[PDB]
Amino acid sequence: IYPTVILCLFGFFSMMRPSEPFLIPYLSGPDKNLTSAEITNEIFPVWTYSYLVLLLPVFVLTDYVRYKPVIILQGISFIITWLLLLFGQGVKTMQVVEFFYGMVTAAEVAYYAYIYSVVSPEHYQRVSGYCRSVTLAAYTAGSVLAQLLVSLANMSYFYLNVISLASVSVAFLFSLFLPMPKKSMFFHASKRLFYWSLWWAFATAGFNQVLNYVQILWDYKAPSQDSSIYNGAVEAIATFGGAVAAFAVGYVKVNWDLLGELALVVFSVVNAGSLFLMHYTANIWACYAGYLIFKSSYMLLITIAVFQIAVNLNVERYALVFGINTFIALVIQTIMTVIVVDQRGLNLPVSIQFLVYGSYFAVIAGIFLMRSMYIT
Ligand SMILES: Cc1ncc(C[n+]2csc(CCO)c2C)c(N)n1
C-alpha cells in the first residue's frame, strides 16, 4: 500500500492544477498579449501533433525502461511545461510548451500501468479505479481552488500559475523515491470488440478535440477582459458530473448487452445536441450548461464502453488494447485538426468550429443508426 499511497499522493499533487481552467484567459490576458486567432491556429494544434508523436514511443518504451522513470519524466515535463508557461513568451515558446504538454499527457499511460507491478495480478481494476478517483478529485479540487481564489481573493493568473507550478513541483518531489518495479509486463511483446473500439476511438477523438477549444469559445462568447468569468467552477462541476456519471454506470446492475445500442445512441444524440447548444447560443450560461451536459453524457458513454470492452479481454493485454485504440483515436484527431482548425488546412475559427464538431457527433450517431438498420 506504500507504493499505492505514493502513487496516489503524486497523482493528487500532479492533477491538482489551478492553471488548467484559466489557461487561455491567462494566455490571452494582459500578461502575455496573445490574440485568440494565433492561439487557436498555431499554439493548440501542435499539442495534439506532439501528443500523437510521443504517444507511441512512450508507450512502447515504458516497459523497456520500466514504469518509474517515465513517471519521473512526466514530473520533469510538468516542471518544464509550467516553467515555460510562467516565464516564456512569444509563439514559438507556446509551441514548445505544447510539445512538452503532449508528453505530459502521454506519460499518463505509464503512470497508470506502474500500479500493475505493486499490488496483485488481479486487483488491477480496483486500485486503478482508486487512482482515477484520486486524479479526478484532485482536478475538481484544483478547479474549485482556482475559481474561489479568482472570485474572492481576486488573485492574478500569474500567481495562480505559480501555485500550479508549486503543486507539480511537490508532485515530482514525491515521485523520485517511488519503488522501482521488478515486475515488467513484457519485454519484447469479436462482433463487439472492433465495433466498440471504433466507437470509443471516434468518441474520444471528438472529446479530446472539444476539450481543447471549449475554453476558447468560453472567452469568445463573453470576453475574459471584462464582465467576469466563471471557468473554474464550471470545470469543477463538469468533472464532478463526469465522475458521478461513471460511478453511476458502474454502480447500477443491469444487462447492458440486451440493448445498449439504443441507450448509447440516445447519449450520442444528447452529446450532439449539447455541442449545437454550444455553437448556436448567444449567452454564456447556456454554453456552460451545455459543457456540463456534454461531458456528463460523454463520460456515461465511455464508462459503458470500457465496461463492455474490459470484461472481454484479460487484464494483461487490457492496457495493450487501450494502447492500440488511443493511437487510432489520435490519428483521427490529427486529421480532424489539420483540416478543421490548422492554419495550413481550412483555417476555421472557433466560431464556425462547434458546428463541425456537432456535425461530427451527429455523423457518428447516424452511422450507428445505420448499423442498427442492417436487416431493414
Ligand atoms: C499547457 C496546456 N494546458 C492545457 C491544454 C489544453 N487542454 C487539455 S485539457 C484542458 C482542460 C479543459 O478546459 C485544456 C485547456 C494545452 N493544449 N496545453
Residue 61 in grid coordinates: 518504451
Resolution in A: 3.4
Which three-class secondary structure state does DSSP give residue 145?
helix
Q: Could you give the count of Cα atoms lying within 13 Å of 48 in the half-sphere of its Cβ?
A: 30
- Reading the block at residue 67, the C-alpha cell is 514504469
Residues lining ligand 1, Cβ inside 6 A? 20, 23, 44, 47, 81, 97-98, 101, 211-212, 214-215, 235
Ligand 1 probe mutation, 15, 20, 44, most atoms within 8 A of CB: 20
d(CA 116, CA 119): 7
Span from the CA of 47 to the centroid of ligand 1 (angstroms): 9
Ligand 1 pocket test, pick from 79, 101, 164, 278 with the greatest ligand atom count within 8 Å of Cβ, gives 101
- Find out whether 48 and 330 touch, Cβ atoms under 8 Å: yes
Atom of ligand 1 nearest to the CA of 82: 1
**Spatial distance between the Cα atoms of 371 and 348, rounded to a whole number of angstroms:** 31
Q: Give the DSSP letter string of 106-121.
A: HTHHHHHHHGGGTS-S
Q: Which residue from 24, 32, 211, 288 has its CB within 8 A of the most atoms of ligand 1, so it is best to mutate?
A: 211
Exposure letters 169-204 (e unless 16+ CB within 10 A, then b): bbbbebbeebeebeeebeeeeeeeeeebbbbbbbbb
* Total residue length of the chain: 376
- Decide if 13 contacts 167 (C-beta within 8 A): yes
Residue carrying the nine cell digits 476558447: 216
> Ligand 1: which of 98, 147, 212 to mutate, most ligand atoms within 8 Å of CB?
212
Cα separation, 41 vs 343, in Å, equals: 5
Q: Which of 99, 107, 111 is nearest to 48 (CA)?
A: 99
* 55/106 Cα distance (integer angstroms): 5
Distance set, CA 175 to CA 14, 130, 164 (Å): 10, 18, 17
Centroid of ligand 1 to alpha carbon of 256 (angstroms): 33
**DSSP character at residue 349:** -
Residue from 66, 105, 106, 100 nearest 82 by CA: 100
Instruction: Report the nearest atom of ligand 1 relative to the CA of 85.
Output: 1
CA 253 to chain centre: 27
By what method was this entry solved?
cryo-EM
In order of start, what are the domains of the chain with their CATH numbers? 1-189 (1.20.1250.20), 190-376 (1.20.1250)
313 alpha carbon to ligand 1 midpoint, in Å?
32
Q: Which residues contact 42 (CB under 8 A, 6 or more apart)?
A: 91, 94, 95, 343
Spatial distance between the Cα atoms of 101 and 91, rounded to a whole number of angstroms: 15
- Ligand 1 center to residue 65 CA distance, Å? 28
